[PDB]
């Protein structure tokens, strides 16, 4: 937050957004390009001339289509295979944060090899190596069970999303309130 200071025009905002964007191409840490959208940047800059990578890679981490981004870019960033590797981590990290409590109802943490293969658009052999490299970089924790096909990943990387935790937090509110009327009033009326 700087309201009073750092006087900047539309010319330097595009130059500043360049270093901010490229930092998130290979950056696997602290959310993704959407943080640059959270700040008044994309609205203050042009939507084309390779400034649209925030919009293309936003849905690319969900649908998992690499042909949309690679077709609109040049050969500069597509020559390095590492860029295509980091895009696979952020795609899976969205679903891996849903294992405990975000969206899913029963709040039970379980992951098989078949369910994660369809979400990451990768086979069973490449998904086992992708999780191991994700934990090795410090983004995640936990262990992996290949015998029973179980994936236990400890929650590390936070997220800025909200609105899906209000309903599931009520589950702890309603289920525990029933013991106040039954068990809670049983000991009090003793």
């Amino acid at each position: 937050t700087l309201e009073p200071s750092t006087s900047i025009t539309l010319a330097e905002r595009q130059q500043l957004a360049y270093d901010l964007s490229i930092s998130a191409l290979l950056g696997d840490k602290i959310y993704n390009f959407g943080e640059l959208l959270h700040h008044p940047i994309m609205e203050t800059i042009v939507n084309d001339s390779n400034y649209d990578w925030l919009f293309q890679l936003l849905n690319a981490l969900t649908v998992g289509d690499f042909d949309k981004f690679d077709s609109l870019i040049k050969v500069q960033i597509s020559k390095i295979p590492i860029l295509a590797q980091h895009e696979s981590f952020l795609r899976q990290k969205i679903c891996l944060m849903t294992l405990i409590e975000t969206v899913f109802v029963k709040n039970i943490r379980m992951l098989s090899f078949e369910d994660i293969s369809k979400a990451t658009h990768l086979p069973k052999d490449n998904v086992e190596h992708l999780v191991m490299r994700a934990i090795s970089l410090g983004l995640l924790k936990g262990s992996i069970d290949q015998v029973n096909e179980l994936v236990t990943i400890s929650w590390v990387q936070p997220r800025i999303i909200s609105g899906d935790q209000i309903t599931k937090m009520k589950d702890r509110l309603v289920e525990w309130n029933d013991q106040v009327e039954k068990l809670g009033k049983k000991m009090e009326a003793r």
Binding site: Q179, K182, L183, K186, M187, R190
Partner: protein, 89 residues
């Protein structure tokens, strides 16, 4: 009444039994009539075999906080600990 009493034994004592044996054990004169008795007793029927999924029991009139309850299991364990305190007090 004897055949109905045997049907209670065939549930636990037989995990899987074919159709031809049920006719011989309970003294049935028809194979089609044999499957008719399995419908009233809720017996799953597959090819040349008869299973029993009804070994698990529930309902049985009304029961509350007794005989393997459901949602009160956590509370009753803590309730039994609070009953001995008031007896001493």
């Amino acid at each position: 009444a004897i055949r109905d009493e045997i049907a209670k034994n065939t549930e636990l004592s037989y995990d899987f039994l074919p159709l031809s044996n049920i006719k011989a054990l309970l003294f049935f004169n028809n194979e089609k009539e044999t499957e008719k008795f399995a419908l009233e007793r809720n017996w799953p029927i597959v090819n040349s075999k008869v299973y029993f999924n009804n070994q698990s029991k529930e309902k049985a009139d009304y029961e509350d906080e007794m005989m393997h309850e459901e949602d009160q299991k956590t509370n009753i364990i803590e309730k039994a600990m609070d009953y001995a305190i008031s007896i001493e007090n």
